[PDB]
């Protein structure tokens, strides 16, 4: 599962992933609650799902 | 189109709707971006859609 960042978001906890508009997020593990875990080149972490769009195929 | 509040939200703007868990939001009109316009009581305003569940 991959996704691309639609809105910027700054981590607020050491377990969160700071994402920026455009980046592709990989190794994405879903889960209800509004937060997903995945990696963007650098770090891995929990990022807010409503700020990114899931890629197809 | 109605929904029920899942998380609490304190409207941080004159045009925002303050919502509380359990409340029924109605006359909701959607719009991309993370904010919906709906109504509770006699109050209407904008609130984050991921903060409520749309009733089936």
């Amino acid at each position: 599962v991959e996704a691309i960042v639609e809105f910027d978001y700054q981590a607020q906890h050491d377990d969160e992933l700071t994402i920026s508009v455009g980046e592709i997020i990989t190794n994405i593990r879903k889960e209800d609650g509004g937060w997903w875990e995945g990696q963007i080149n650098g770090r891995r972490g929990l990022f807010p799902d409503n700020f990114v769009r899931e890629i197809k195929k | 189109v109605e929904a029920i509040v899942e998380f609490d939200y304190q409207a941080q703007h004159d045009d925002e709707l303050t919502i509380s868990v359990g409340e029924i939001i109605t006359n909701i009109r959607k719009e991309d971006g993370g904010w919906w316009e709906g109504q509770i009581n006699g109050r209407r305003g904008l609130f984050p859609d991921n903060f409520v569940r749309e009733i089936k």
């Binding site: 807010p48 | 998380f7 719009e31 993370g34 991921n50 903060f51």
Partner: peptide, 11 residues
């Protein structure tokens, strides 16, 4: 131009 979206609370 919608305002910035809000993340769902960490619960």
């Amino acid at each position: 131009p919608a305002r910035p979206p809000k993340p769902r609370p960490r619960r």
